[PDB]
Amino acid sequence: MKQVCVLGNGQLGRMLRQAGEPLGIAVWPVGLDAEPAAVPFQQSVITAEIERWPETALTRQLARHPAFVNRDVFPIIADRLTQKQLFDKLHLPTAPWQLLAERSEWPAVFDRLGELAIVKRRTGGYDGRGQWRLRANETEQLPAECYGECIVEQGINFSGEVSLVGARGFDGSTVFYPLTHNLHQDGILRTSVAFPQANAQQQARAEEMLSAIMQELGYVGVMAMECFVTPQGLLINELAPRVHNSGHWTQNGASISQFELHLRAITDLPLPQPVVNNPSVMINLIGSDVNYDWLKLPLVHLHWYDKEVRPGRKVGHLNLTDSDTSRLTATLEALIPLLPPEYASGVIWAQSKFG
Amino acid sequence: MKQVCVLGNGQLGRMLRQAGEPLGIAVWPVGLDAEPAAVPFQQSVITAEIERWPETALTRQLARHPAFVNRDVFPIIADRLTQKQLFDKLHLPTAPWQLLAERSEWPAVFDRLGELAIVKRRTGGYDGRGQWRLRANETEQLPAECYGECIVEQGINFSGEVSLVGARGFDGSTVFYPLTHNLHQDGILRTSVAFPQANAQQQARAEEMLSAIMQELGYVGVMAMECFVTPQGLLINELAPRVHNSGHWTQNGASISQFELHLRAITDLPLPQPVVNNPSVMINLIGSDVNYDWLKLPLVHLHWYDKEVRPGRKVGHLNLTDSDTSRLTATLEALIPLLPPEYASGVIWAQSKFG
Numbered sequence A, B: 001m002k003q004v005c006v007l008g009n010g011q012l013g014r015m016l017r018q019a020g021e022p023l024g025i026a027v028w029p030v031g032l033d034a035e036p037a038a039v040p041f042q043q044s045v046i047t048a049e050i051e052r053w054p055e056t057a058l059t060r061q062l063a064r065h066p067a068f069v070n071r072d073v074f075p076i077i078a079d080r081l082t083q084k085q086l087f088d089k090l091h092l093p094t095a096p097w098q099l100l101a102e103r104s105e106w107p108a109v110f111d112r113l114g115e116l117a118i119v120k121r122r123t124g125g126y127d128g129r130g131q132w133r134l135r136a137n138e139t140e141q142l143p144a145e146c147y148g149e150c151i152v153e154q155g156i157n158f159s160g161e162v163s164l165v166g167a168r169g170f171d172g173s174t175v176f177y178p179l180t181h182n183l184h185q186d187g188i189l190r191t192s193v194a195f196p197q198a199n200a201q202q203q204a205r206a207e208e209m210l211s212a213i214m215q216e217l218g219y220v221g222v223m224a225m226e227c228f229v230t231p232q233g234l235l236i237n238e239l240a241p242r243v244h245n246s247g248h249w250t251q252n253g254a255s256i257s258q259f260e261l262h263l264r265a266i267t268d269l270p271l272p273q274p275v276v277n278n279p280s281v282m283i284n285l286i287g288s289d290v291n292y293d294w295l296k297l298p299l300v301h302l303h304w305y306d307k308e309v310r311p312g313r314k315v316g317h318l319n320l321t322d323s324d325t326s327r328l329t330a331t332l333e334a335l336i337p338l339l340p341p342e343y344a345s346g347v348i349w350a351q352s353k354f355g
Ligand SMILES: Nc1ncnc2c1ncn2[C@@H]1O[C@H](COP(=O)(O)OP(=O)(O)OP(=O)(O)O)[C@@H](O)[C@H]1O
Pocket: A095, A118, A120, A125, A126, A127, A128, A129, A131, A153, A154, A155, A156, A157, A161, A184, A187, A188, A226, A237, A238
């Protein structure tokens, strides 16, 4: 019975453990502060749900582990500069950008990028923290700390956002789910909607890009590529070297979930193409307490994280899938009065995807 | 918040625990020999995946425990003599029978029940162990121990077997799954097939019968009723006061699984009718080692129990569901060479359901 250890103690690891169980794979999520002595890392394949970390007794032990899959890929992706350079190397479309070295460069930056600059911390950002959207007369708001520690990109006016989640096997095979439509508000993902068949052109463009990246990196497991939809085609925004929030719908809307797919990849099990026959919606639960009334609606799949509820925190997600989009829209409509007000916008945006 | 302890350490408990996690319900399977001092009985709803048990430090604590849902139904069900009588008291069709008290009753038993008698141990039987099929000149095979400890009933020539899995809530509401077709060989269930819409007359007869049963008992949770199909309609074979093997398909083929439904009922959560839109097939894994090649087929959902593989032991099950029956048939066909010989019969029988 394969053993896998996942570095990091969040919901991602928990979902990987839940997926592993019925497949006969024991998965052990280990936080950074864990005691290595307690960790069966020796008899396990190591994976992670994080991409960067401080040095601890646990991480020092891991360091010397032969089977930490993708170990060397993380730092490249963990630093936005190196990630952006990777797209450049591979000729992949992405927002024009540059390292933002010091105050003095501002003039050349706007000259280069346009009216709106999007400044991003090279490492550690998530949910939009560590991101600034500045105009020529607003540069003084950027913390000095940021000089040398941030990249700056052109503000992209996309018509929508989509991510491609897929996986690469140790033998180079790759498999993908259809593109997923993502809605972000205030920097955090709120809702995702996936259809069995995406714009065929967009789907091929994305697969070619993701494929080139996984190959170049020699990556094994699941990776998510977030892109921006523009009239010239997609632009890659960023990558996540792991299972990703946008693909949670796969737990209930694909024959093989992103969690199962990642475990198959890393343990070298078969990686056939997951079957996706119907559309799916996923609503993220953020800073809200669980309301079991949601369970009155039979299509709603509750995925609760057993995390402390605090503002802005991802606490769970709700998935719904059905071959009849009317049912989905109706389920959505019934959910509105059962969710806090800030959820209406995303729920309605999901409904409109079927309109 | 949800804390449930389940009496019994088998795969059913494990599947209840996997189901409860994402719902935010912490499920603790407790074996009979467990140390009561290590169990959260005081802060939980108690359920069980077994129906009769010896007195141990652990079960002693469960006697009369107010949090143990259905505690008094178990014993009624656990004895076939009491179970049969229930049917009788509710005018529900069942096989003509009687308590088999002693050797001398034999000639009259055959005069009354006809050619073939089915002897069954009053308690503890499963997978056909404790059952004997006898003609009038074979009674000497029945161990002497049986007299007074087994019932005897009419061998029924049924055209097929179907089970009804459903639940009853604390307020009397009930919900059910469509009937499932079950195939038993050598006393053990090998395969099940469910269709979204079952014979209407049949489904209604089953629901009326099971509702009468659960209501009569004040039962809360999931119960399964195995029946035999005959030209006068269904005959009830036996009941399982819990989630049941023939309902495993609901893990992937219904919007709410029988595991989830049981936890909903017992925790007083909502109990809407689960959605079932496509057919499902479940192949029981018995005494065989896991074969990861099964995973090359994308529709296959592996549910491995993490049990030691021994002859005749249920080690797992494979579920498959899709709206396209031709897909299911093709997946079944591909499964044959990937399973031991003894599985062909069952797989073919499933395929035949779609023929
Ligand atoms: N150049 C850009 N132009 C316009 N919008 C942008 C741009 N970069 C980011 N955004 C918007 O901000 C959202 C969050 O940005 P991004 O993914 O870089 O940050 P993050 O902190 O890494 O978020 P996370 O890791 O949680 O996805 C994007 O999905 C998009 O809505």
